[PDB]
């Protein structure tokens, strides 16, 4: 003699894929600054749940795809309305820079002249700029001239790595996994529900993960499949390591009028002696972190198995080097001096034409930056592959994994407040 | 109002039923509701969809004659084929998550029987004048 | 329907209470609801926001057990600390604008106490069967 009773506001949920919305940090054309999410701050909206063990899987987390999708969209929106350097896709007459250049810089700098347009469509002007060899091809020409359109990044737009917070839309909630030493998948006995996530900086890099979070206790090593040599392995350090990168050669830039309201920024002569870019790593801490990684790798590969670290062999800059972005300049640094050990000065190169995500070109043309650059970052993690004694090398992957490494603690579910149960009550 | 919310889920259905307003009060406003059409259009789309979801559940309660209140008695008997547990067994030992899974198979059937409120309204008019 | 609207505000709360539907009937349709995405998008955004505002107030009334009707008795006693006037003093000498300012300080407190309708619903089920 039981009856159907309808209940509304029932605390149940199911996995779902929805759009999460960003939130800003208040405190001004720094990209995120225009595409503001509206500031939040007093939002420590965290509730502990008892029991209700739930499962997580960081390699199936759709939030990663959203981060990728919107950051790339915003990148284009911020840089679309700029100059479009059609007139620079011309023949270059180049010579060598003969200034006081060290051995490590020989062949790196070219002095090139060309016939540039003017604001008055009758006349041409003779213009020259210094160029780096990685962006120039001998036939000379700009290296991407025969492939796709080239632009110039707006000089007032700065893609600063400002942390962005994400929050659920109404009808949704985010479950945060607090399990200590969680390896990225399966049941998480300790979960809390939140309104929003902590902030994540949109740092794009290769090989080493910079300025992210640190592991709570131990160095964590996780991958979709530990024994699959076709997969990338994510290593999170419990101790930060500083890396000091510099760009020497104090310089200036010239503002060249190229059309009626259009300006190009040229690279001027170097003040003082000419040296290469480079990075400094403390050998003491590099040795410690690799030893810690090995101690943990041995858990799955054998503690009687010798583990070696080796160079990032591959076919290109975006594959073999450590990519950084400091001061608006793009660096491609040599890490072969780090991954050389069986169980520190790193020379570095720079470029102005950056494809970023391959596609068709984009070619934002990082403008020349005046003065010098000093940049110090926190190494918080590492991505490795194995070749199979076993050997590990710096790995690959898209920017997606520079999100996944932070996003792994959060999952979003859909709330379904209406349902029924038997009671003894009849209308 | 995350003063309390889905934490109710840690206990039994009986206990959880005493705090139903705790979740209801958190269903209409996301962060974008507290606060270049590129990118920003997504916030507009999300707000609209949230509204639609809310209204669909309210419409269903309206149709069943259960609009208003948290708990609605239906005058539709419970089928013996839907579950085989003591009433007190489900209210004291089961959670709502477990319950929802157990009777998922009968969702449409149960809802279809809530159409009976229409027959009740016709009877009520005839004897009401 | 500007046949009459906020003109009720010129008088006392008592008098104004007799014409509450006068304002309610004017809350869902702006000029854009009677009637190149550039510029026009603003009309779409405004219509959506108007809907959201409406629903949030309706949801609050739903939660309090006051959904439906213009006037709802709550069974929650009035605190002596909220005001110190004769009941007839406020209804005959004060306007709603004045009143809203006078007790603004207690808005959240009063609303928090309207959660008691949840306890009433649990009691009602137990003694209803």
């Amino acid at each position: 003699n039981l009856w159907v009773t309808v209940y509304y506001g029932v605390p149940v949920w199911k996995d779902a894929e929805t759009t999460l919305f960003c939130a800003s940090d208040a405190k001004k054309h720094n990209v995120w600054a225009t595409h503001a999410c509206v500031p939040t701050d007093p939002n420590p909206q965290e509730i502990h749940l008892e029991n209700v063990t739930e499962e997580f899987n960081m390699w199936k987390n759709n939030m990663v795809e959203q981060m990728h999708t919107d950051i790339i969209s915003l990148w284009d929106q911020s840089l679309k309305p700029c100059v479009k350097l059609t007139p620079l896709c011309v023949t270059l007459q180049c010579t060598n820079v003969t200034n006081n250049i060290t051995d490590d810089m020989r062949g790196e700098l070219k002095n090139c002249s060309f016939n540039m347009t003017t604001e008055l469509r009758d006349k041409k002007q003779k213009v020259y700029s210094l160029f780096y060899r990685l962006d120039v091809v001998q036939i000379y020409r700009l290296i991407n001239c025969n492939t796709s359109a080239i632009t110039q990044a707006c000089p007032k737009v700065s893609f600063e790595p400002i942390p962005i917070h994400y929050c659920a839309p109404a009808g949704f909630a985010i479950l945060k996994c607090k399990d200590k030493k969680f390896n990225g998948t399966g049941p998480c006995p300790s979960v809390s529900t939140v309104q929003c996530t902590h902030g994540i900086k949109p740092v794009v890099s290769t090989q080493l993960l910079l300025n992210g979070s640190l592991a709570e206790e131990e160095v964590m090593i996780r991958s979709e499949n530990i024994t699959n040599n076709a997969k990338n392995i994510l290593v999170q350090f419990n101790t930060p390591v500083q890396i000091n990168c510099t760009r020497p050669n104090n310089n200036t830039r010239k503002s060249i009028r190229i059309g009626p309201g259009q300006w190009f920024y040229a690279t001027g002569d170097i003040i003082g002696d000419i040296r290469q870019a480079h990075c400094n790593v403390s050998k003491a801490t590099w040795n410690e972190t690799l030893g810690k990684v090995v101690k943990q790798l041995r858990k799955h590969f054998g503690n009687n198995t010798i583990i070696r670290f080796a160079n990032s062999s591959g076919g290109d800059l975006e594959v073999t080097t450590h990519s950084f972005n400091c001061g608006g300049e793009f660096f491609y640094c040599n890490t072969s001096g780090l991954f050389n050990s069986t169980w520190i000065t790193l020379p570095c190169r720079i470029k102005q034409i950056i494809n970023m995500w391959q596609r068709i070109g984009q070619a934002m043309y990082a403008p020349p930056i005046q003065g010098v650059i000093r940049c110090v970052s926190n190494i918080t993690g590492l991505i490795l592959t194995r070749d199979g004694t076993e050997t590990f090398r710096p790995g690959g992957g898209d920017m997606r994994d520079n999100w996944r490494s932070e996003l792994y603690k959060y999952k979003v579910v859909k709330i379904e407040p209406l349902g029924v149960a038997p009671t003894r009550c009849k209308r | 109002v995350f003063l309390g919310f889905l934490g109710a889920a840690g206990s039994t259905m009986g206990a959880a039923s005493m705090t139903l307003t705790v979740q209801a009060r958190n269903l209409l406003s996301g962060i974008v509701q507290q606060q270049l059409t590129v990118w920003g259009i997504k916030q507009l789309q999300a707000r609209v969809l949230a509204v639609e979801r809310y209204l669909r559940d309210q419409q269903l309660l309206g149709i069943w004659g259960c609009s208003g209140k948290l708990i609605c008695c239906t005058n539709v008997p419970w089928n013996s084929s839907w579950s085989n547990r003591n009433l007190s067994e489900i209210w004291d030992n089961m959670t709502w998550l477990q319950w929802d899974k157990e009777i998922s198979n009968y969702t449409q059937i149960i809802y279809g029987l809530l159409e009976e409120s229409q027959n009740q309204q016709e009877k009520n008019e005839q004897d009401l004048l | 329907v500007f046949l009459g609207f906020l003109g009720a505000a010129g008088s006392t709360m008592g008098a104004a209470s007799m014409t509450l539907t006068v304002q309610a009937r004017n809350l869902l349709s702006g000029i854009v609801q009677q009637q190149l995405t550039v510029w026009g998008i603003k009309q779409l955004q405004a219509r959506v926001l108007a809907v959201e505002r409406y629903l949030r107030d309706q949801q609050l009334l739903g939660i309090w057990g006051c959904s439906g009707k213009l006037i709802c008795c709550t069974n929650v006693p009035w605190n002596s600390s909220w005001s110190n006037r004769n009941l007839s003093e406020i209804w005959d000498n004060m306007t709603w604008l004045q009143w809203d300012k006078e007790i603004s300080n207690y808005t959240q407190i009063i609303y928090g106490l309207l959660e008691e309708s949840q306890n009433q619903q649990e009691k009602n089920e137990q003694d209803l069967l």
Epitope: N43, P44, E46, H48 | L3, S11 | -
Partner: antibody, heavy 125, light 107 residues
Amino acid sequence: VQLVQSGGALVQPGASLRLSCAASEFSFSTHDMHWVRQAPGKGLEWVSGINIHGGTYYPDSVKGRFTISRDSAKNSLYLQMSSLRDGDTAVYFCARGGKPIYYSGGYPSWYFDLWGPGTPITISS
Amino acid sequence: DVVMTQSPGFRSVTLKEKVSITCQASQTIGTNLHWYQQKPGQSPKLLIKYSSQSISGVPSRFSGSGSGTDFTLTINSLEADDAATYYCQQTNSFPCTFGPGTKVEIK
């Protein structure tokens, strides 16, 4: 108003013990109640708690060994502990959870307005 | 977990001095910090809640503020009766946690 407490005790390792508190001049049925313990030289470790609807919360440091219960009829609280260790030596206290800023349902505020006098337990051979 | 620390371990103060001690969190706790005091042989007492709210029964000379990871407790003019060990607790993230305490000795 106070939390009236039982006296202290000495037990052997592996022993079980029941502690209790009572509500003087108030009802326990209107408050979330918690137990904490103060080991010599330490601050207050939260041990357990029960909400107004009978739901409970436990630390992983005691979960499976400690149980919290309430009997509102007599205005009493209990803490039942099994398999006690020397490391569990502490002064045990009951405390009345502080009033929350806004309604949460049976979800504690995790801070306290009312503290009892303290009941020491020594576990030793 | 939220790790809470306090500084100094103890403070040596004298009467009618304006004094202060601080608390820190390893991670942001918003404004969910509460201050307590305890005297030897006594049960604990709560003095300040939610970073800056007053509590009836607590003298007006006690005040404080803070957010995120950094909080301060102060006494406008120290009294002999204020000797105590002062403690911070956080309620932002479960398990609830507390710091080691700062002892205030009065001369």
